[PDB]
Amino acid sequence: GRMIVIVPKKYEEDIEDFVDWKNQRGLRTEVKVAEDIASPVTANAIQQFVKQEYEKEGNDLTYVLLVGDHKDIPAKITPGIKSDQVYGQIVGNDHYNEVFIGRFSCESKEDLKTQIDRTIHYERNITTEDKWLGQALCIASAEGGPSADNGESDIQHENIIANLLTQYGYTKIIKCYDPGVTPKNIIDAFNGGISLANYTGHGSETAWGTSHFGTTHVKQLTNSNQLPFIFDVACVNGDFLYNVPCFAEALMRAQKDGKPTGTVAIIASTINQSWASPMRGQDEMNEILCEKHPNNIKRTFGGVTMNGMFAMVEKYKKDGEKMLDTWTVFGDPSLLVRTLVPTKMQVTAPANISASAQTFEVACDYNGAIATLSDDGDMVGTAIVKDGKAIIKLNESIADETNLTLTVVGYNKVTVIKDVKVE
Amino acid sequence: RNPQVRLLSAEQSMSKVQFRMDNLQFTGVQTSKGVAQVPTFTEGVNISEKGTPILPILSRSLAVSETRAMKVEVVSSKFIEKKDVLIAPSKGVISRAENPDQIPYVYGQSYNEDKFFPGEIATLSDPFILRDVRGQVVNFAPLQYNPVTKTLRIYTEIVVAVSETAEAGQNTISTFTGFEDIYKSVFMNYEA
Ligand SMILES: [Ba+2]
Ligand SMILES: [Ca+2]
Ligand SMILES: [Ca+2]
Ligand SMILES: [Ca+2]
Ligand SMILES: [Ca+2]
Ligand SMILES: [Cl-]
């Protein structure tokens, strides 16, 4: 597939390194200046642009990343709905998304820089030394009963998720169940190191009902580039239209001595959530995350969460649709999620490539890995590793080139980057 | 997931889906009319209107016709009767702004109506389009309850035939291969 980054003119130069990396790692990424769509930027204009981009040759548009807060790129507003997800609802009068939507909500250049830096570091720079991975945090309220999804209390619901994660390979589960959860309990879980967090309970625009951990406690986080992604079942935690930064925005924008803290990604609601339907969505998200043979789309934060929310519409109908529309992705929707401590890949590639070459062979011990040839952020060719090798087909001449960049990414693998000399 | 729910047949857009009751349980709850029962079963979901009996349903997605309106027909059904049963009334859609433990079970006017609720043992949800595939959800309602007679009908097996009609459908459509695995996981009749 491919991604379009919709960016305000003031942030156009700042997203350059991000776009380079996405193309370098095998995801075709283009930029659209928000003011070039319409000035001022309206929800309706974004819709007709995403729809017209989707209809372009190949029908391969899969991700849309929105850059900026609501004043920069607005959310679609309808009675009782604040939505970014509706931008991905292109084919059919239904709530089943064709395109995965994500947002880098920022009110400063620093807010954008830290969201770019944390995304690139997560995909490119995570090593076998990142031992905070494969550790999850389960948070639950002391409420829920027969009226909830699968007649489970929030604690019973989180305990089932905890068992599923442990079975998959998560080496540590931190359980913070009400009564008595304090903000310090959450601060310590983040600082100790976690790669996933699940929340089920009440919420406000700036805090969690269970723990009372909020936007004011985010400055106490010291998890420098040790960031979890969160499946958040709570009201208004993702209301990025609020007069002060919302819960999800504070965690995505968090910095400590120029290093990213908080979260790499979070799915949080812009409105009050229903009791049962988001529990179903949260379960399916964790089940898709814990799948053994999913596609490269179900390997992304947008793909995992959206496919999880599809079951919610299937089982809870109109109420599930209302939850899907408002359960907003904060972060890169194409983010290649990590669940465990990565293992190294054995990558064998020729040191040189012929100027008149049409293909490039790459040997890799991990089948399903994506091998990509790039030229300073411009994708030259990409191929999947099958039967121990990737045969990269060049989509342009490299006759005048001196060097090419080879990038190999793999699920829960250390990213391999090599230089290829052009002979 | 209910393991007894299986695809019997699949030809073009036509599908034969079998439902079988799995792990049916009843939870006793406090109500104004005394102890009432909250029914639960594997993959069972309560979408019952507030004040009407809690009668969980099972929903499954199917890849359907691209241009025509679909219909659902019960080709096979089997039920057992449970007499003098008090089924708990639905609390409806509860917001996470509320505490459900503090919300009481309140009986609506539907509890004075001498008929079986919801009425249909099989329905179709509104058709949708997921990228290049037109889909539709089939719903099994294996718990039918008459509040006046206090009789509960437990459908142990329901076989439905989902086929196209002579009518034009709602939300109709009209290389990339990335959504193939999504179609396989969403639709139980896609691989077939
Ligand atoms: Ba659950
Ligand atoms: Ca759609
Ligand atoms: Ca905001
Ligand atoms: Ca060049
Ligand atoms: Ca370079
Ligand atoms: Cl129809």
Residue A270 near residue A75 (C-beta atoms within 8 A): yes
Known catalytic membership, residue A202: yes
The number of beta carbons lying within 10 Å of the beta carbon of residue A344 is: 13
The residue from A108, A130, A158 where one domain ends is: A108
Cβ atoms A215, A245 nearer than 8 A: yes
For residues A236 and B154, give the distance between their C-alpha atoms in angstroms, rounded to a whole number: 40
Q: Which two tokens stand for residue B182?
A: 């999504």
Q: How large is the greatest C-alpha to C-alpha distance in chain A, in angstroms?
A: 69
Nearest CA in chain A to B130: A96
Nearest C-alpha neighbor of B160 from the set B11, B7, B1: B7
* Claim to verify: residue A97 and residue A114 sit in the same structural domain: no
CATH of the domain at A404: 2.60.40.10
- Record: contact B182-A298, CB cut-off 8 A: yes
A290 catalytic? Reply is no
Residues A203 and A99 in one domain: no
A62 touches chain B (CB under 8 A): yes
Phi and psi at residue A85, in whole multiples of 5°? -60, -35
Which tokens in the block code for residue A10? Answer: 């003031």
Domains annotated for chain B, with CATH where assigned, are 1-192 (2.60.40.3800)
Neighboring chain B residues of A201 at a CB cutoff of 8 Å: 96
Boundary (domain end) residue, out of A83, A108, A133: A108
Burial class of residue B177, CB neighbours in 10 A (0-12, 13-18, 19+): exposed
In chain B, residues with a C-beta closer than 8 Å to the C-beta of A55 are none
When CB atoms are compared, the residue of A58, A59, A272 closest to B95 is A272
Tell me if B179 and A297 make a contact (CB, 8 A cut-off).
yes
What's the number of domains chain A is made of? 3
Cβ of A98 within 8 Å of Cβ of B95? The answer is no
Shared domain for A168 and A209, answered yes or no, is: yes
Range of the domain at A412: 341-423
Residues A85, A40: one domain?
yes
With a CB cutoff of 8 Å and minimum separation 6, the contacts of A379 are A23, A24, A26, A28, A372, A373, A395
- Ligand 1 centroid to Cα of residue A138, in Å, is 12
Binding-site positions of A read 69, 91, 94, 96, 98, 152, 157, 240, 249, 283-284, 287, 293, 375, 401
Whether residue A41 is found in the same domain as residue A138: no
Q: Do A147 and B181 lie within an 8 Å CB cutoff?
A: no
What is the per-residue burial (b if ≥16 Cβ within 10 Å, else e) of A28-67? bbebbbbeebeeebebeebbebbbebbeeeeeebbbbbbb
Collect all residues with Cβ–Cβ distance below 8 Å to A163 and sequence separation of at least 6.
Answer: none
Closest alpha carbon to A344 in A192, A153, A127: A127
CATH number at residue A257: 3.40.50.1460
Q: What's chain A's length in residues? A: 423
CB–CB of B156/B21 below 8 Å? yes
Residues A171 and A273 in one domain: yes
Cα–Cα distances in Å, from A106 out to A103, A114, A239, A246? 9, 10, 14, 12
Same-domain pairing of A114 and A256: yes
CATH code, domain carrying A14: 3.40.50.10390
Instruction: Tell how far the Cα of A191 is from the centroid of ligand 2, in angstroms.
Output: 40
Ligand nearest to the CA of A401: 4
Residue A179 CA: distances (Å) to CA of A137, A188, B34, B99, B175? 16, 18, 30, 14, 54
Question: Which of B40, B46, B96 is most worth mutating to test chain A (most A CB atoms within 10 A of its CB)?
Answer: B96
Q: What are the two backbone dihedrals, phi and then psi, of residue A206, each rounded to the nearest 5 degrees? A: -115, -5
Asked whether residue A50 falls in the same domain as residue A118, the answer is no
Residue type, A303: G
| Secondary structure of residue A248 in the 3-state scheme | helix
Calpha distance B137→B157 (Å, rounded):
18
> Which contacts (CB < 8 Å, 24+ apart) does range B167-170 have?
B167/B68, B167/B69, B168/B67, B168/B68, B168/B69, B169/B65, B169/B67, B169/B68, B169/B69, B169/B70, B169/B127, B169/B134, B170/B69, B170/B126, B170/B127
Burial per residue of A91-115, b for 16 or more beta-carbon CB atoms within 10 angstroms, e otherwise: bbebbbbbbbbbbbbbeeeebbbbb
Nearest ligand to residue B66 Cα: 6
Q: A108, A129, A155 — which closes off a domain?
A: A108
Task: Name the one residue in this structure whose structure tokens are 């909020």.
Answer: A214
Distance in angstroms (rounded) separating the CA atoms of residues A350 and A361: 8
Q: How far is CA A290 from the centre of its chain?
A: 16
Same domain, A118 and A100: no
Residue that the structure tokens 């709905």 belong to: A81
A166 CB within 8 Å of a chain B CB: no
Amino acid at B112: N
Q: How far is the CA of B136 from the centre of ligand 6 (A)?
A: 9
The helix/strand/coil state of A216 is: coil
Claim to verify: residue A140 and residue A221 sit in the same structural domain: yes
Q: 173-192 in A: which are within 8 Å (CB) of B?
A: none
If asked whether residues A129 and A198 sit together in one domain, one would say yes
Nearest-5° Cα angle at B160, B158 to B163 = 175
Supply A20's token pair: 């380079």
Please tell me the distance between residue A377's alpha carbon and the centre of ligand 6 in angstroms: 47
Are residues A86 and A121 both part of a single domain? no
Task: Name the catalytic one among A138, A176, A235, A246.
Answer: A235
